[PDB]
């Protein structure tokens, strides 16, 4: 609930900036905001910032 909206990793993502994470597949990102147009914000494994919302799937 306090997760908010959830996404699975689809593919592995190397952060290419300060502001952004960086997941493998099957890591989950959480607490998840739909900002800006393809670039989401939301936590995963401790650190929070911007990823690419073709790169994960949405949970439920």
């Given amino acids: 609930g306090h997760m908010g909206i959830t996404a ?16 493998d597949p099957d890591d989950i ?17 401790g650190r929070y910032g911007l990823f690419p919302a073709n790169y994960v799937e949405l949970r439920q």
């Fill in 29 to 45: 990102i959480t607490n998840i905001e739909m900002i800006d147009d393809g670039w989401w914000r939301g936590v995963c494994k």
């Fill in 8 to 23: 699975i990793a689809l593919y592995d993502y190397q952060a290419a900036g300060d502001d952004e994470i960086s997941f």
